[PDB]
A paper describes a structure:
As the first reported host of “non-pathogenic-derived” pili, Lactobacillus rhamnosus GG is a gut-adapted commensal lactic acid bacterium (LAB) and one of many clinically investigated probiotic strains for human use in the prevention and treatment of certain gastric ailments. As with other Gram-positive bacteria, sortase-dependent piliation in L. rhamnosus GG (called SpaCBA) is assembled from the ~30 kDa SpaA (backbone), ~20 kDa SpaB (basal), and ~90 kDa SpaC (tip-located) pilins. Two immunoglobulin (Ig)-like subdomains comprise GG-SpaA, each having the conserved residues of a canonical E-box motif and internal isopeptide bonds formed between either lysine and asparagine or lysine and aspartate residues. Our findings show that the GG-SpaA structure has certain features in common with other pathogen-derived pilin-proteins, such as the Ig-like CnaB-type folds and the presence of internal isopeptide bonds6940.
As an alternative, GG-SpaA protein was fragmented by limited proteolysis as had been done previously for other backbone pilins. This produced a 15 kDa-sized fragment that can be crystallized in two different forms. Here, these metal ions can be seen at the surface between the molecules in the asymmetric unit stabilizing molecular packing in the crystal. Metal ions are primarily coordinated by aspartates, but glutamate, lysine, and water from asymmetric and symmetric molecules also seem to participate. The structure of a 15 kDa fragment of GG-SpaA that had been generated by limited proteolysis is identical to that of the C-domain of full-length GG-SpaA (see preceding section for details).
Author numbering:
A (entry chain C): 175 to 298
B (entry chain A), C (entry chain B), D (entry chain D): 176 to 298
The structure:
Amino acid sequence: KTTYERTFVKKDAETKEVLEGAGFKISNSDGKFLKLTDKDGQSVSIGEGFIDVLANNYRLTWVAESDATVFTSDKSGKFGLNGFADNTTTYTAVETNVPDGYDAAANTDFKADNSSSDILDAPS
Amino acid sequence: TTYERTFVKKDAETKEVLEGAGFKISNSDGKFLKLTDKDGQSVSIGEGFIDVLANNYRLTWVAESDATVFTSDKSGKFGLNGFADNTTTYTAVETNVPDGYDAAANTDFKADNSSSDILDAPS
Amino acid sequence: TTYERTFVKKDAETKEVLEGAGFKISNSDGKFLKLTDKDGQSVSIGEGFIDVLANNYRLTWVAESDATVFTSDKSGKFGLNGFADNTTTYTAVETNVPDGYDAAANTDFKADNSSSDILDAPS
Amino acid sequence: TTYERTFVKKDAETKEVLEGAGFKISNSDGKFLKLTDKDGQSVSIGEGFIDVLANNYRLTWVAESDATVFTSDKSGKFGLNGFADNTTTYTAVETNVPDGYDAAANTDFKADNSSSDILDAPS
Ligand SMILES: [Zn+2]
Ligand SMILES: [Zn+2]
Ligand SMILES: [Zn+2]
Ligand SMILES: [Zn+2]
Ligand SMILES: [Zn+2]
Ligand SMILES: [Zn+2]
Ligand SMILES: [Zn+2]
Ligand SMILES: [Zn+2]
Ligand SMILES: [Zn+2]
């Protein structure tokens, strides 16, 4: 069936330069967090950047925070994924891994609406 | 002499079986079920019914974070044999929810060799 | 110069030794015992008494979630040598309870080279 | 352009260097230092000074439970290079205490390329 995607671009709040290596978990209103598995329900190692769930035949599951997948901004500051089942549900991108020299961005509320948007990390 | 329990995960609307829904099992002491091998080591289990007896596994009760996750297979089924006790209440808690679904309500049960459905509502 | 402690896990009713009961050891600072190798790395231990001295392990005190689990063997036995101090109170806390049993009460002890029983009640 | 910091763990009585004492590093936001590789993955570090620059690691600030533990080596040494900032106060918190010792007090520091002692009292 049809799915939805979301992209984010991590940036320095002052210079607007893209920031690599900022790690995020995605939560729903049930207090569960997004975990990617392969087709056999096994954990997968993902790198930085946008994760092509569709091309890799991954599955989205919602799990306890500690078992969640960390998504990490790449060289272009980008991260996210496709393959979301629902575009009307509010999720929150929570910065769990903050690059040194920066403060965590505020939580970013979003829907899987196929858009791209910026997340700013303040220096210091 | 032991007891078993099976569950079948289904879509609450269509009743189609649902694969990949993960569950932990708790007791009234607030501990959760962990399978080990005969030497007390963790084992990797897949989806479906776990034949504890055939594999010589052991059932232990541990902290939630160390617990075994049981996952519905292609036929929506999961569970296990090897329970010592058929009169004790346990709860199946959905900890890993398939995307596009809401978590089912907690399912109270006894290890009575029965099989029963657990429904996940579409989101 | 070091000290050791052994425990024997048993069924409280039958007194039969019980294998697969897992324990963490805490101190009064609320930290828990972790064994490492000579390079500070985690080690996988099995059931039974752990010969820390022979394996050149080290004892460290860490957060509960990073602690080593000691597990009763076929003879119901577990524990270790290599304790630096015999006058300090520690507590053996049952974290992994064999199915069909209740957790034993916490067991206060000192590393005094003694052996003592820990009883798990059925149910 | 980056900064480094070294610490030497010692017995407060004998001043002999102490191996196997584990530390986390926190900032004023209550987050703790985690080293990752270039692809944001966790890395296994051993004891001693961590050459972040040579290994192309990254410093990130995370929840205490996800933090990297730095551990004193044979020479009692630990620390790292690669800090972005030399004017910000951090704290070295002993999380893994060698048996036979008390935890050192928290050690406030800046990444100023210096080396300094941290003392663990016996008992
Ligand atoms: Zn919901
Ligand atoms: Zn209930
Ligand atoms: Zn719903
Ligand atoms: Zn017997
Ligand atoms: Zn044995
Ligand atoms: Zn990597
Ligand atoms: Zn103390
Ligand atoms: Zn201070
Ligand atoms: Zn010195």
